[PDB]
């Protein structure tokens, strides 16, 4: 299963926050999703189809070593504080998820 780090990230309101999801993929058929616990999908890699007039503060990018992914949130808000994880979606052959351990985000005033 993918790993998700750091286990605790503390940032200030308005700042950027970046977790790293490391997933050793055996193929290009996978979808790497970023979730928040109530799970709610925030973003994916590859990114879902774009829609005009719809912008997102959450992004998943693949680093050049191919194993690591950055899960970035911009303009962090107080209510973004919570529990997050990433999961890899693939065919089992049935649809299957492999979830990372959970990590915590804390967004503080100022």
């Amino acid at each position: 299963p993918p790993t998700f780090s750091p286990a605790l990230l503390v940032v200030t309101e308005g700042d950027n926050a970046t977790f790293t999801c490391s997933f050793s993929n055996t193929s290009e058929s996978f979808v790497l999703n970023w979730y928040r616990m109530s799970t709610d999908k925030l973003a994916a890699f590859p990114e879902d189809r774009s829609q005009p007039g719809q912008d997102s503060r959450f992004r998943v990018t693949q680093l050049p070593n191919g194993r690591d992914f950055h899960m970035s949130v911009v303009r962090a808000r107080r209510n973004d504080s919570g529990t997050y994880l990433c999961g890899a979606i693939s065919l089992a052959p049935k649809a299957q998820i492999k979830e990372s351990l959970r990590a915590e985000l804390r967004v503080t005033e100022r």
Partner: antibody, heavy 119, light 112 residues
């Protein structure tokens, strides 16, 4: 480019077996599930089964569990589907199809192999 | 098995018109915050070609006019402006569970 090239059309008598090839190229063969699907003339699409070429893990639709064998030869990047005890109702175009985008089992297709079963 | 029901059986439209195709599943396609529904186009003598996966995302090189929507048990394929090369049969297919299953198809034919 991902390419899946199947063997040619076959005409078979009832009771016979047919072994269809799918030659894969343009990607790493052992990293993606390979599916088999058939379509009867003017008819809709029916999944037969799937194999993962890395370890030959195989899942078959219950309808075909006792007449179908799906195999791979890693040395030639070729997948095979062998259908036994052929019946008139097996006349169909048989397709191999490769997964992609981590949820789509059917994302790349071979050109199809017509198998006509007749006396 | 998850049974897929497509409607209407046939759509009779002109180039430039909007085509809206429906696919209903006998139980939910969804898992992990996603929808496991795929759409294909098929012309005579050819294999199907994937247009949509995870039932709004596009396959490679699929024109902008093809879009997918829906969740749970109700899905839609939209072609916002028909081109002559779009008159085809279209299939939906789910990947949430095996056996993988297909709808019966919707033929988009030329109105005259």
């Amino acid at each position: 480019q991902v390419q899946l090239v199947q063997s040619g059309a076959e005409v078979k008598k009832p009771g016979a077996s047919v072994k269809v090839s799918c030659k894969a190229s343009g990607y790493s063969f052992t990293s993606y599930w390979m599916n088999w699907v058939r379509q009867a003339p003017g008819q809709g699409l029916e999944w037969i089964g799937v194999i993962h070429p890395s370890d030959s893990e195989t899942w078959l639709d219950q309808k075909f569990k006792d007449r179908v064998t799906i195999t791979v030869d890693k040395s030639t990047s070729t997948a095979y589907m062998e259908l036994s005890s052929l019946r008139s109702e097996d006349t169909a175009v048989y397709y191999c199809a490769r997964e992609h985008y981590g949820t789509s089992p059917f994302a790349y297709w071979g050109q199809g192999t017509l198998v006509t079963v007749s006396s | 098995e998850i049974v897929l029901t497509q409607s209407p059986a046939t759509l009779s439209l002109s180039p430039g018109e909007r085509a809206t195709l429906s696919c209903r599943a006998s139980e939910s396609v969804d898992n992990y915050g996603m929808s496991f529904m795929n759409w294909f186009q098929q012309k005579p003598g050819q294999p199907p070609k994937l247009l949509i996966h995870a039932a709004s995302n596009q396959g490679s090189g699929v024109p902008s006019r093809f879009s997918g929507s829906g969740s749970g048990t109700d899905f839609t394929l939209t072609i916002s402006s028909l081109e002559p090369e779009d008159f085809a049969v279209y299939f939906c297919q789910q990947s949430k569970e095996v056996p993988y299953t297909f709808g019966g198809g919707t033929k988009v034919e030329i109105k005259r």
